[PDB]
Amino acid sequence: EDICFIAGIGDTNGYGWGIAKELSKRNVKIIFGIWPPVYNIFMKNYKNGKFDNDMIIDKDKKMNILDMLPFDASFDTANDIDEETKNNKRYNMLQNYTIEDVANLIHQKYGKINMLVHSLANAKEVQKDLLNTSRKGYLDALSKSSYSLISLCKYFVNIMKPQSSIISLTYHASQKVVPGYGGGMSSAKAALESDTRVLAYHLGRNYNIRINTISAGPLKSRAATAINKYTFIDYAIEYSEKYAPLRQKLLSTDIGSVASFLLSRESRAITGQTIYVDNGLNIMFLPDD
Amino acid sequence: EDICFIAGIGDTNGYGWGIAKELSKRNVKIIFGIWPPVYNIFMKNYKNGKFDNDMIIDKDKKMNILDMLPFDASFDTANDIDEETKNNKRYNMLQNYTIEDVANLIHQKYGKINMLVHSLANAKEVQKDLLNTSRKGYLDALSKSSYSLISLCKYFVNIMKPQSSIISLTYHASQKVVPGYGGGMSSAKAALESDTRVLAYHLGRNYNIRINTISAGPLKSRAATAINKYTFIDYAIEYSEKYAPLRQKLLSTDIGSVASFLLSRESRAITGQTIYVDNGLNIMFLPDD
Ligand SMILES: NC(=O)C1=CN([C@@H]2O[C@H](COP(=O)(O)OP(=O)(O)OC[C@H]3O[C@@H](n4cnc5c(N)ncnc54)[C@H](O)[C@@H]3O)[C@@H](O)[C@H]2O)C=CC1
Ligand SMILES: NC(=O)C1=CN([C@@H]2O[C@H](COP(=O)(O)OP(=O)(O)OC[C@H]3O[C@@H](n4cnc5c(N)ncnc54)[C@H](O)[C@@H]3O)[C@@H](O)[C@H]2O)C=CC1
């Protein structure tokens, strides 16, 4: 029985969904971690069957979601919750949404898991360029998009089985400059990739757990659409579809099937790596046009 | 009907064999390309059942070998083979072993294939360090170990279906220095890796075909043993098992399962990449003890 917790899903148009979809093809139980502010709305859409078609698997089956829990990557433990949030309308009717709390919650209800997916990003000033990003906004991007991975590993390793696997999503902006990806997001991804290597060492040596990161190509999702700089995401997609070695549309399931492989034992020898799933765009220097 | 041609197998102790074994789990037909000098010995052992145990695939499956053909990567076409090798004791009783001839041969007997594996390397002066390698020895290593890939692509591309996949094997000595990996082999691996990217562009744009390379960890194979440096290989294996993030023996089938994934459609969005399957050793800078 393989159980996978996916941190970072707010709809069916992101990478988290493509990953859950592909893992279902392999019969793995899925648990969603939903950011509190969109939890109730997500449950409403779910309950009203708005995701039904999106849950049908190729092999003529239904995606099996074990559970859906409110989850906020910016809070490590219960005593980290501040006043302003502890009174927020969207957080009031919710409890146990901190990293340690969800880990205890999952362990208590379903036992130990063996697959972990970090699929979340957030930066307050993603619209501003690096030079004009404030210290507060910069640290916010790193806390939510980078440190969250470290904390997830620290708390979930206690409820994971040996030889389990972890993955996260990153973007090439960390290695090469892409104008438009601001707010410290490029910085956060750079830390994520570096941290993945160091975590691979500690997790590998002490628990025999693997951890890799997938560098994906452009995907018109909510997080992306909110980067605007006809917006940043529309440009990257068009560019990728014109100049990438492989001229085909990049689907969330393309990252999903690769994630599925990295999360399985088929890849027991791969760890601390940044795997590119972008139709090869990253190998290009000079375009044809 | 998936058909894969594996170029570079002289026994069951190499990566070519582990790859063949893993591909058989997915029921893909295997065609072996055997270097002429060792063709007779290999057929002899196979015939006398000296590989029957190695052909056992976990699930009691029996490795499915479609065909076994003599093959020499140093010759592009029939009129490339010199008089000497032509009348050589080991080549006399054989024919159609050049790159162009095996392609036409496979096509004529089985039609188009969709999987190509370049699993060979060779260097006359591997025992010498770069500084002391002659021009002749250097060009020989590149000719046999690097150009062979480009040539294989040129002739096999015509007998491959769209969306097919190609992989080769490389070693980290191309990116970082490992004393002992001489004769221009480090050079050859560097070329192969760069060529993999360039070919991904061409193969991808014109044939919608993918090509990637696997950077494997140390394996005590025949080619590896030739690198007399208690030999280079024993050191590398011992060093990998004591310092890699994942302390475990690296099996040929570990590279095999990754090869299998890259050759299947599950990796449609990956191309031109160098994927490390080395228990994570490449991410380390300073060893522990
Ligand atoms: N869309 C793209 O073009 C690319 C995306 N990526 C990465 O893929 C990952 C997922 O992003 P997408 O599928 O693009 O977008 P997405 O918008 O579907 O997913 C991001 C999720 O993070 C959640 N989030 C924000 N702050 C949170 C917090 N404090 N706690 C928990 N959840 C929180 C949101 O609810 C959202 O569902 C991100 O890490 C992103 O950087 C990597 C390459 C490209
Ligand atoms: N063993 C190791 O530690 C590592 C090996 N590699 C690569 O893996 C690939 C396969 O090597 P191994 O499994 O190590 O050794 P192997 O010695 O079993 O296989 C190489 C094969 O190439 C064939 N060969 C040599 N010249 C040829 C020619 N002109 N035409 C056709 N075949 C020819 C040999 O018969 C041999 O079977 C090589 O490209 C090697 O560089 C990459 C990382 C590590």
XYZ file of N, CA and C and ligand atoms in Angstrom, chain A residues 8-11 14-16 35 38 71-74 119-122 144 169-171 181 185 189 216-219 221-224 233, ligand 1:
143
model
N 0.314 21.210 -1.939
C 0.228 22.244 -2.954
C -0.746 21.974 -4.091
N -2.035 21.936 -3.775
C -3.072 21.727 -4.779
C -4.240 22.636 -4.448
N -4.726 23.360 -5.450
C -5.843 24.258 -5.232
C -6.840 24.152 -6.364
N -6.558 23.250 -7.297
C -7.420 23.038 -8.450
C -6.837 21.945 -9.331
N -3.045 22.619 -12.150
C -1.646 22.724 -11.793
C -0.909 21.412 -11.934
N 0.355 21.409 -11.524
C 1.187 20.211 -11.591
C 0.811 19.171 -10.543
N 0.338 19.633 -9.393
C -0.051 18.716 -8.340
C -1.087 17.734 -8.843
N -4.159 24.563 0.791
C -3.904 25.839 1.448
C -5.249 26.360 1.983
N -8.152 28.416 0.279
C -8.901 27.852 -0.835
C -9.496 26.489 -0.509
N -3.844 22.650 4.812
C -2.413 22.612 5.060
C -1.722 23.917 4.684
N -0.962 24.474 5.617
C -0.245 25.712 5.353
C 1.248 25.534 5.613
N 2.024 25.573 4.530
C 3.469 25.383 4.578
C 4.260 26.458 5.316
N 3.616 27.561 5.661
C 4.315 28.627 6.357
C 4.342 28.455 7.877
N 4.764 20.547 -3.943
C 4.338 21.182 -5.186
C 3.732 22.553 -4.934
N 4.421 23.372 -4.151
C 3.897 24.687 -3.832
C 4.931 25.798 -3.938
N 4.454 26.978 -4.309
C 5.297 28.156 -4.449
C 4.465 29.389 -4.106
N 5.121 30.425 -3.601
C 4.420 31.652 -3.260
C 5.392 32.773 -2.954
N 8.117 30.387 2.233
C 7.054 29.576 1.657
C 7.486 28.602 0.558
N 9.117 20.589 -7.198
C 9.149 21.172 -8.533
C 9.987 22.451 -8.549
N 10.797 22.614 -9.585
C 11.632 23.797 -9.698
C 11.562 24.320 -11.141
N 12.181 25.468 -11.391
C 12.161 26.064 -12.719
C 13.551 26.613 -13.047
N 10.327 36.559 -13.978
C 10.251 35.680 -12.810
C 10.904 36.404 -11.630
N 11.587 34.694 -6.470
C 11.207 33.344 -6.872
C 12.385 32.599 -7.490
N 14.055 29.176 -5.905
C 14.286 27.954 -6.666
C 15.758 27.549 -6.623
N 10.436 21.649 -14.342
C 9.423 21.614 -15.374
C 9.428 22.794 -16.331
N 8.764 22.594 -17.465
C 8.621 23.633 -18.463
C 7.380 24.434 -18.105
N 7.009 25.446 -18.904
C 5.836 26.294 -18.648
C 4.503 25.567 -18.645
N 3.647 25.946 -17.703
C 2.309 25.374 -17.584
C 1.381 26.508 -17.150
N -1.005 27.588 -15.231
C -1.737 27.257 -14.019
C -2.013 28.557 -13.269
N -2.682 28.455 -12.126
C -3.006 29.632 -11.333
C -1.747 30.379 -10.885
N -0.832 29.671 -10.230
C 0.408 30.283 -9.755
C 1.152 31.005 -10.883
N 1.240 30.354 -12.040
C 1.927 30.914 -13.200
C 1.222 32.153 -13.736
N 3.611 33.866 -18.420
C 3.371 32.465 -18.752
C 2.986 32.227 -20.214
N 3.503 26.668 -13.905
C 4.786 26.633 -14.240
O 5.000 27.190 -15.442
C 5.859 26.044 -13.402
C 5.773 25.623 -12.075
N 6.790 25.031 -11.271
C 6.472 24.728 -9.865
O 5.380 23.799 -9.768
C 4.867 23.973 -8.395
C 3.327 24.013 -8.399
O 2.915 25.183 -9.115
P 1.762 25.219 -10.228
O 1.224 23.896 -10.698
O 2.440 26.109 -11.214
O 0.740 26.095 -9.593
P -0.462 25.843 -8.697
O -0.876 27.300 -8.582
O -1.509 24.838 -9.077
O 0.146 25.289 -7.274
C 0.779 26.026 -6.199
C 0.029 25.801 -4.922
O 0.695 26.307 -3.719
C -0.318 26.600 -2.738
N 0.249 27.587 -1.772
C 0.706 28.887 -1.653
N 1.130 29.250 -0.451
C 0.947 28.100 0.311
C 1.183 27.818 1.663
N 1.659 28.698 2.525
N 0.892 26.579 2.114
C 0.446 25.644 1.249
N 0.102 25.797 -0.035
C 0.410 27.066 -0.478
C -1.511 27.144 -3.572
O -2.788 26.893 -3.042
C -1.360 26.456 -4.940
O -2.300 25.374 -5.162
C 5.440 25.281 -7.840
O 6.388 24.930 -6.887
C 6.028 25.915 -9.057
O 7.098 26.760 -8.738
C 8.005 24.683 -11.825
C 8.188 25.005 -13.226
C 7.108 25.681 -13.905
